[PDB]
Symmetry: C4
Subunit: 385 residues, 4 copies
């Protein structure tokens, strides 16, 4: 309904920083707020998945997250499957200057994937009592999905900027048949990323166990600057949640919508749930953990592209343990600790008893939410500033 100019129309899309949540007609104690989600047969108390990023998730973090009631995804195309000991490599990435990290990563990530390390990472996480969740790009799945199946991973994430049931490739590159993959894999398969109703619906029809929503909102993402592609998160989430609801009516199958990236605070999580997300996928808030493999740094997994980097490396620092970050007690005033407590406290304030009710809360378009009254916080770099 918007005219850009003669013969070119558009629709308005809203970002995470443009919306706010409105109380209902009841309130509830946060201890009564049910935050569960489920993917396949796996129920989780914390509706947070740590991103498949080398500054965020290694084997230890995947286990720690699982034990807290959350999940972490190991990237099978990152350093974890290229080096038997990733630690010196992670140290090098964290130690070089702002003008050196692109070139360094272009080199370090050229070391080949060792399929024996795909098996090892999965089996060590499972041996330790963790849920083993692993990612591959569509081309990576053409080569290694059978290795993941043989290893017996609990969840497979096929994730890239876009993942399509209608991908055109030169005949030398094996395009991935997502319908065949979902049917043949012995575990649930999460597909993404997408930002539209039409694509999310197609991914669900192909057999996805969950869909990942988001193109470019990430803190370490440069895709929107490199390509111009993206839909801001509230709008993308709502459109994909509508596809979930239509797919549920058509088949009786519930495919959760995961809002992926661009989340820093508990308020950001809540705003994503209120737009329809069943769960969120976050990286930068978890890269701030004492146990995070990034050593206080966080980088995009397309930063090492040898031809066109589409991520950067940022310094997020280290603010607490992963336990403090997910379940507190919070040590900070900015909503970046005790993320589960923040979700339950927000649901309580809004009267939302469970995640489905949270997705039904009233929303306002409120670009002044993060700026009204905040001049001192911005000037002094405190609180929200």
């Amino acid at each position: 309904n918007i005219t850009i100019g003669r013969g070119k129309t558009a629709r308005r899309a809203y970002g995470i920083d443009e919306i706010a949540l409105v109380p209902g007609v009841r309130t509830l104690d946060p201890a009564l707020a049910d935050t569960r989600w489920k993917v396949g047969a796996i129920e989780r108390e914390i509706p947070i998945i740590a991103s498949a990023m080398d500054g965020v998730v290694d084997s230890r973090m995947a286990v720690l997250l699982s034990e807290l009631g959350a999940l972490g995804v190991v990237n099978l195309e990152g350093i974890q499957t290229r080096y038997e000991d990733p630690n010196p490599i992670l140290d090098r990435i964290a130690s070089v200057g702002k003008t050196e990290f692109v070139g360094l990563m272009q080199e370090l990530y050229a070391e080949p994937i060792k399929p024996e390390l795909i098996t090892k990472r999965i089996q060590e996480i499972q041996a330790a009592g963790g849920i083993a969740a692993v990612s591959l790009t569509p081309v990576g799945a053409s080569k290694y999905a059978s290795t993941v199946a043989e290893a017996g991973a609990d969840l497979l994430f096929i994730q890239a900027t876009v993942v399509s049931t209608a991908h055109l490739s030169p005949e030398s590159v094996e395009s991935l048949d997502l319908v065949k993959l979902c049917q043949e894999m012995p575990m649930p398969v999460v597909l993404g990323n997408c930002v539209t109703y039409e694509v999310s619906l197609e991914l669900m029809r192909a057999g996805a166990a969950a869909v990942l929503v988001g193109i470019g909102p990430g803190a370490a993402s440069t895709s929107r600057g490199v390509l111009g592609v993206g839909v801001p998160q509230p709008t993308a989430i709502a459109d994909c949640a509508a596809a979930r609801d239509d797919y549920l009516q058509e088949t009786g199958r519930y495919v959760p919508v995961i809002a992926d990236g661009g989340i820093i605070t508990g308020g950001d999580i809540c705003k994503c749930i209120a737009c329809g997300a069943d769960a969120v996928m976050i990286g930068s808030p978890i890269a701030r953990a004492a146990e995070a493999p990034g050593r206080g740094f966080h980088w995009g997994m397309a930063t090492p592209s040898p031809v066109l980097p589409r991520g950067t490396r940022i310094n997020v620092g280290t603010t607490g343990t992963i336990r403090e970050i997910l379940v507190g007690p919070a040590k900070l005033d900015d909503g970046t600790h005790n993320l589960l407590g923040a979700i339950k406290t927000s649901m309580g304030t809004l009267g939302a008893k469970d995640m489905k009710e949270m997705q039904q809360v009233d929303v306002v378009i409120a670009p002044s939410l993060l700026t009204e009254g905040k001049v001192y916080q911005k000037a002094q770099q405190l609180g929200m500033g």
Copy 2:
């Protein structure tokens, strides 16, 4: 009427910095502008209440405010009822670094409330000739409202982020029956906070003497970042003023709407009145007084939460006496002094003879109000910048 995406709608809400006031067809000398408001049987010449915050109101400030024609609320869950001498505690809060205040306050605020100090603060304010206005959260009122009644306070404020007539609690926590409280308390009971028509109407129907509007606009507030909850002030005020007007038609009872927080200048006050407020509640402008207990600092009363802080500590400085701040003469060029003079001068410019007429002034949506022509003021940190 706004579509965020398929199946998710919203409405636009406007912040304090997005609106402006338009002159009418007459003007009047500021000396002719009537700024009075009334709560219960208490008439006040200055339609300003100092927030129940430990950097803003102690016993002395409550008396000084009362004598100037305003009001101040003592927080009965803060340091004033936990320590017989709050001064060394206030000094410690003001003296620690930006990375220490959360942890310090989490500890200092764990000292138990002394019910004898609730009685003492009320009686010392009254003995000194002040109006004794005190606050409790709903749980705090379940424990101490009978102590407040026995002490004979002039006003009770039941205040929290949200206060509900429909609160769900585990059975070990006593939910507060607001209808019973308003009926049984011997003094007027102010309830808040809220941001919607439906809740404000319910609070009025429960017996509120006034309603407090605002979730997260505060200068020392981090709730919007932690939770994602809030409605920007102009929209919240207007919706709650509509509830006041409907309640007045239904019962003949007038329940004033108090716009609470996010106000720095006289223009901010005026914009809140123009959206329907009968009075404003402000903290940071009063924390700048020479007599303010915060020693030039101002912190949110949820900063000391042991599990999830939802306020921060800011440095507001000290710019004048409380008399200069409320009634001048102003020493500054930025509208943060002589707040009563600013209200009367604005009402004069607009032709508003009284507060009810001020609530009826024409408003524009004008995001350029605070930026048009202001490049030098912003660059040089002068005036409005």
Copy 3:
């Protein structure tokens, strides 16, 4: 047509920085662009009036401006009529620190007006061959309009934040009858300021020779922060130009609309003309002249209020002579020199042959006009940044 909330409506108003001018179907050489305006019987080639501000206009500047084809207004309530030699006073104002100027001006401006100096300033400007244009507030005109008439000034400006035909005053203050003033004064009387159709129409009906539009856009203005009052300039200008056009149809009399303040560049002037202005009143761009009495500083004329300052002092610097600023050749790349050349070049680009055609150019709402492509200019403080 905008809902702020239930029972509170608004309209959208646009600022100078939100609009842009669109070419027509012809272009013309700038030498062919007619920039004239007329007030009373006084025709001017340059449609710029220097503001009645003590950093901008003294007797010499009033003459220099007149001789260039522009105008300058001497404030008869400022330092020029309080001190026989204003120079040491102007030096003191320019020399004190950012924390001292309010208090200093509150004192310096308390020196009484000398009616002999009203006569002297007028007669010296006229003796020197300049057009003598002088300002008074409505109360100042009750006391001194007969002195201005006796001295034989060429134009009288009755100017304040608001000037009303319906002003309510205590009986000890003489309200000014604008109808009587316009009828009795022997010279044209310019009235302002206003921002609405209704008030501008009333000022025209009272006998105004021109109306001044603008509340708070000024570079040295703090009224919008102190009071919350104002309408951004494009909207205010358009509404007042509609009153001009209706008054012309009703009476056959043409009353020019002067856009007053918030202009820094030639583009700002052009945008104001395109919204309906016949001329502009500017201060800060002229305070940058080598001959400006402000010595590189520029302050609001309500900064010296002893009770509620509503202006500030800014440092504008000195960038050229008044000739360079109005007619070039320009020495700068930012459109703050050769303002007449900028108007003619803009009119040429748009195909506007005269000021009336410039007022009819197509406009877009374009908040990206000043930011699109400008990242380097902003970062390096060059050009538009």
Copy 4:
């Protein structure tokens, strides 16, 4: 459809930073994306033209660009035709301080054009195997178009802020008849700049081989500040592309629309194509080449105006070779290298097989595209910040 005020209407126009591109229902490998464009009989693989700016294009750069599959335009009114050896002049421009470059350029650019150097630049580019593309303003073409024709240039660009078929000039200045020029020139003639449907259609009807769209988006442009004139790029491009499509239906002739200026990244290019552009004209990204004549600086070609400069000089630095900037491999994370790879990767993501399909991609209005999640990148001056 927008009301600025009574009697003044406007339409909303959108800038490059306000839009985003939405995936379709298929994706394709970037190697399959066809990026070609054509002007006259000249087909180009890279749909990028380097701006006719002295910091961007000299003879060597024109040849290097041609050989890479792009184009570069030599400005025949710049230093290249005024000095036999431009190098010492370019060195002087790059070496002076921020307060000196306007005055320096006003002097250096006053050296007369040598028509022998127009012939020489054209013939040296062609002798070296490059496509010789040259620019003149309309007045410059009245004097030198016959010299360009005699020299046998491959493309002539008649370019200025505006170029009109209906230009009014004093009789001492020869207005250019564009219809006669296009008919008589032996090579294709590109005309611009414009931002409207009506003007672009007239330029096409006059015989333009392509039209240049854009007034003031440039990184080194100050025209919008000096004049207030411009339409943000997405809206201007769409309106002019509608004129192209109508002209094609009326005549069967296809006139490409070139989006000119304000582009820094590959995403900026893609957003311009998606609004209807067949190709883009860029300066600042190419001024960052090791081979760029600006020595790391980039200035507007109206900066040297002796009366009213309408450009500035910025420091863009040097980030790679022109090969790295256009075709990679990229060394940076911000989308300013491998611009062709960025276009093909964006087209791939969107399912666009060719440039015409790219012009048909769905667009959202998304002011949060460049800010959502980007706080660390902005704070640390990394990636998109």
